């Protein structure tokens, strides 16, 4: 609700935790620490 | 485009976390206890006492000396009264011990408390709290690996005395306000969840999933030598023939004493007939100087990749008083060997630590309690090594048809229900697929769930095997 949005803005808090584990993602081969391999993301986090 | 991977895809499983709800936290009644150590000095204890007193509970504080004893703690416990909850805050501010990776006071001290408490037959469900040792995903820094050992034995404890050992939590270090959010819900939870993975958002109870195999057109070449723990004794032996089928030029599988007791003339001659210029570690891996000399004694020639953690040593430990020192003595080969390889291979060129382990680490094994801490330490090491190169690996390799210490009473006990023996060539094929994909949790085992659920349930309910379609019916 917008009230919670304003409360978060006033208190100065971020809403970034990690990745979702419900939508059946592989989550595992998504980042081979070499950037240029196929199927390798770069974000170890986000807001979902 | 393929139809013969069935058996390879049959023995493919994985561990992961899934967000769940909560029970019905109404009111805790009793004389709840807390005991970290003699040091105490933790504001988390104050927050826990505040929450427990808010939830109608009498809070009492106890102090314990590092390896204080085995029975005096029971003597003071029996003089207090009846309790139904203990907060073991002893895992705070002690991330990883010194040079000895298993000489942690928390582990052995907790075993002493549980032994004294069953001796006193008090009946309270133990509730332990650890720091960040379990990762909700591969995108996290596992702060240390020793704490995971607490989990490895812990599940087995749940089988030994189901009336106690309520469960564990995660509660990442710093910003302890999470322990002031629910706390009472977790301990006083009617859902019976025990593998709690508390984090910044809700709860993340542990679950077991199938590992579907998306086969890809890639290739891993074992050029030169390969790192596999165990050398030629047992598990390594057949493994040594696998690369013989592959045709690797060299090998340096690490063994306890090499030609002294491993390999022998028949295997040596057969391997040299198949593939020449192959070696096995003749020196003990526990000594750092021995590993340095072995690495300096090589002819350089060829690097490798895909570090492996199959198995190194088998040293009993079914059920006993279970002191902490004997576990370290048993694991002193394998854990310090892995530590030495990790220390000495950082500056070389490889990919990552593609771990293997025994199947006893996955879930609670009543007869292999002492085997779990080494596998848990290996898992923590692999998760830490993920930081550079290639992702981690959590293989939980089972039992061989032709070898393995767990072939007597162990295989007799779980061969009548669930698990059976497994051929070696299937293991080679599954391992080739695993290295082709390089997953982080390739549990490799075959089990018959129809009797396995009945055997595992017995008297303790569990919400673990709820993601297997066959387990539902």
């Amino acid at each position: 609700t917008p009230e919670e949005f304003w409360e978060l803005l006033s208190e100065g808090r971020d809403a970034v935790a990690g990745l979702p584990t419900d939508r059946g993602w592989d989550l595992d081969s998504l980042f081979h620490p070499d950037p240029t391999r196929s199927g390798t993301a770069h974000q170890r986090g986000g807001g979902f | 485009r393929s139809t013969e991977v069935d058996e390879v895809s049959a023995l493919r499983y994985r561990i992961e976390w899934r967000p769940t709800g909560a029970g019905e936290p109404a009111r805790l009644d009793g004389t709840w206890l807390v005991a970290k150590y003699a040091g105490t000095a933790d504001e988390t204890s104050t927050a826990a006492r505040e929450a427990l007193e808010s939830a109608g509970a009498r809070v009492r504080e106890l102090v314990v000396d590092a390896r204080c004893g085995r029975d005096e703690l029971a003597e003071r416990l029996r003089s207090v009264g009846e309790v139904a909850g203990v907060l073991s805050l002893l895992a705070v501010d002690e991330a990883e011990p010194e040079e000895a990776p298993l000489a942690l006071a928390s582990l052995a001290d907790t075993l002493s408390l549980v032994q004294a408490m069953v001796s006193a037959e008090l009946g309270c469900p133990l509730w332990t709290v650890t720091e960040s040792a379990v990762a909700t995903g591969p995108f996290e820094r596992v702060r240390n690996a020793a704490h995971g050992a607490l989990w490895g034995v812990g599940r087995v404890i749940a089988l030994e005395n189901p009336a106690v050992w309520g469960g564990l939590v995660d509660v990442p270090a710093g910003s302890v306000a999470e322990l002031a959010r629910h706390l009472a819900a977790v301990v006083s939870g009617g859902a019976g969840e025990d593998q709690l993975a508390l984090r910044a958002d809700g709860v993340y109870g542990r679950r077991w999933v199938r590992a579907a195999a998306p086969a890809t057109d890639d290739e891993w070449k074992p050029t030169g030598t390969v790192l596999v723990t165990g050398g030629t004794g047992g598990v390594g032996g057949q493994i040594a023939r696998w690369l013989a089928r592959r045709g690797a030029p060299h090998l340096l599988l690490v063994s306890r004493s090499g030609p002294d007791a491993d390999g022998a003339g028949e295997l040596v001659a057969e391997l040299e007939a198949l593939g020449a210029r192959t070696t096995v570690a003749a020196c003990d891996v526990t000594d750092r100087e021995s590993v340095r000399e072995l690495l300096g004694g090589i002819g350089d020639d060829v690097p490798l990749s895909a570090v492996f953690h199959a198995a190194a040593t088998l040293d009993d430990g079914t059920v006993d008083t279970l002191t902490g020192e004997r576990i370290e003595r048993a694991s002193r080969a394998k854990v310090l060997g892995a530590r030495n390889l990790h220390e000495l291979t950082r500056e070389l060129d490889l990919t990552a630590f593609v771990l293997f382990s025994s199947f006893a680490s996955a879930f609670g094994a009543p007869g292999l309690g002492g085997y779990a801490p080494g596998n848990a330490y290996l898992d923590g090491l692999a998760q830490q090594r993920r930081s550079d190169g290639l992702p981690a690996t959590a293989v939980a390799w089972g039992t061989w048809a032709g070898s393995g210490m767990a072939e007597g009473p162990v295989a007799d006990r779980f061969r009548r229900h669930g698990v059976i023996e497994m051929p070696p060539e299937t293991a080679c094929r599954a391992l080739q697929n695993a290295l082709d994909r390089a997953e982080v949790c390739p549990i490799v085992i075959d089990v018959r769930w129809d009797r396995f659920l009945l055997a595992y349930t017995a008297q303790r309910p569990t919400r673990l095997f709820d993601e297997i379609d066959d387990a539902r019916r």
Side-chain angles (χ1 to χ4, degrees), chain A, chain B residues 1-42 44-473:
Chain A
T1 64
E3 213 283 336
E4 304 165 14
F5 191 27
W6 164 249
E7 150 194 333
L8 163 152
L9 285 180
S10 84
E11 94 176 27
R13 182 194 38 157
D14 81 284
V16 183
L19 276 80
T21 45
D22 324 64
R23 324 178 188 183
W25 294 15
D26 158 38
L27 196 69
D28 267 341
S29 80
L30 265 195
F31 29 95
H32 175 277
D34 176 62
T36 89
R37 254 199 74 193
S38 278
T40 54
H42 279 24
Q43 274 197 269
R44 328 294 267 262
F48 297 86
Chain B
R1 284 171 291 183
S2 180
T3 37
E4 218 259 335
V5 85
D6 36 355
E7 63 268 356
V8 186
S9 68
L11 302 82
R12 294 300 310 91
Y13 299 93
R14 174 146 60 107
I15 322 184
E16 101 177 344
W17 316 87
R18 192 104 48 213
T20 164
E24 315 91 2
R27 175 51 51 93
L28 262 169
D29 188 13
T31 42
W32 248 237
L33 195 45
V34 66
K36 165 247 210 180
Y37 267 133
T40 50
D42 303 315
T44 66
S45 71
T46 308
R49 101 162 293 111
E50 162 264 341
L52 264 297
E53 284 179 357
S54 76
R58 261 292 290 112
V59 180
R60 289 181 181 274
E61 307 182 351
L62 203 84
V63 316
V64 152
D65 159 274
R67 305 104 181 185
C68 71
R70 312 290 99 73
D71 293 332
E72 201 280 330
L73 53 146
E75 298 164 357
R76 37 202 187 185
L77 276 156
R78 61 196 56 172
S79 64
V80 176
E82 147 65 24
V83 278
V86 168
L87 265 302
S88 269
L89 208 50
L90 84 173
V92 152
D93 79 80
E94 295 185 339
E96 148 160 19
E98 325 310 305
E99 312 85 13
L102 296 183
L104 191 34
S106 71
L107 180 32
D109 262 323
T110 279
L111 327 164
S112 61
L113 330 171
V114 306
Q115 274 265 346
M117 171 275 268
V118 47
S119 75
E121 57 268 325
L122 163 42
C124 95
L126 163 55
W127 282 99
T128 169
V129 46
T130 86
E131 249 70 14
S132 64
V134 278
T136 200
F139 40 56
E140 306 292 346
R141 181 41 195 198
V142 194
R143 193 195 69 263
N144 94 88
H147 275 324
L150 289 175
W151 295 68
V153 53
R155 299 183 199 76
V156 177
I157 303 306
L159 301 177
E160 309 320 296
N161 197 26
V164 304
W165 181 267
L168 321 95
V169 294
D170 174 35
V171 56
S175 77
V176 315
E178 289 75 305
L179 269 175
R181 307 292 297 280
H182 332 118
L183 157 53
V186 165
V187 50
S188 74
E193 203 95 322
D194 43 16
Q195 322 302 96
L196 273 289
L198 200 64
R199 274 301 196 85
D201 303 333
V203 283
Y204 281 99
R206 214 161 91 113
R207 313 240 153 181
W208 185 311
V209 196
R210 281 193 181 279
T216 326
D217 301 332
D218 287 314
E219 181 295 335
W220 165 79
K221 156 62 55 178
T223 190
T225 80
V226 167
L227 321 196
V228 167
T229 53
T232 89
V235 169
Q238 284 336 282
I239 283 304
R241 303 170 190 174
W242 170 48
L243 316 84
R245 310 196 178 188
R246 274 311 208 194
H250 315 305
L251 217 40
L252 62 82
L253 298 209
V254 308
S255 63
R256 152 246 310 269
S257 293
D260 155 75
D262 274 330
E266 48 266 5
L267 170 69
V268 158
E270 160 267 333
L271 288 183
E272 290 296 318
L274 282 177
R277 199 58 162 80
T278 47
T279 84
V280 283
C283 285
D284 163 31
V285 302
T286 308
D287 181 20
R288 165 181 296 279
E289 309 316 302
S290 65
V291 188
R292 167 63 57 84
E293 292 156 353
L294 282 186
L295 201 39
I298 77 188
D300 320 329
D301 176 35
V302 58
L304 68 137
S305 293
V307 157
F308 298 144
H309 291 242
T313 299
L314 303 153
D315 297 337
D316 40 302
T318 293
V319 48
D320 70 280
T321 89
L322 292 151
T323 204
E325 172 266 341
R326 67 179 73 202
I327 329 177
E328 192 273 327
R329 164 201 57 91
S331 199
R332 199 186 312 260
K334 94 164 292 183
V335 282
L336 299 301
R339 247 288 292 272
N340 298 342
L341 325 190
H342 173 107
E343 189 33 62
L344 278 187
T345 299
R346 260 200 217 82
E347 47 267 355
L348 249 195
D349 191 273
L350 289 94
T351 41
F353 293 2
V354 180
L355 163 150
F356 318 139
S357 154
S358 80
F359 100 89
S361 162
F363 46 52
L368 293 181
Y371 288 65
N375 308 278
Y377 204 51
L378 290 194
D379 176 27
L381 185 38
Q383 303 274 26
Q384 276 157 218
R385 187 46 184 70
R386 188 276 326 152
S387 285
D388 78 90
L390 185 131
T393 300
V395 164
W397 254 17
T399 63
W400 295 153
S403 80
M405 158 300 304
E407 219 185 7
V410 196
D412 199 14
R413 281 160 53 193
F414 331 102
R415 249 203 282 99
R416 59 199 84 154
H417 48 61
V419 84
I420 49 139
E421 285 281 44
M422 191 205 158
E425 171 65 273
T426 62
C428 328
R429 298 213 84 260
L431 208 72
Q432 158 58 38
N433 175 277
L435 275 314
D436 206 354
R437 195 143 54 254
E439 287 171 61
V440 297
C441 189
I443 320 290
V444 175
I445 200 183
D446 192 332
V447 88
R448 280 300 306 114
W449 270 271
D450 158 77
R451 297 197 300 272
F452 196 73
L453 325 183
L454 303 188
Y456 205 105
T457 296
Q459 54 273 351
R460 214 171 201 261
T462 318
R463 206 177 305 284
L464 182 56
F465 301 83
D466 311 34
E467 288 53 43
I468 302 173
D469 68 329
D470 317 319
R472 307 180 173 180
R473 293 140 302 262

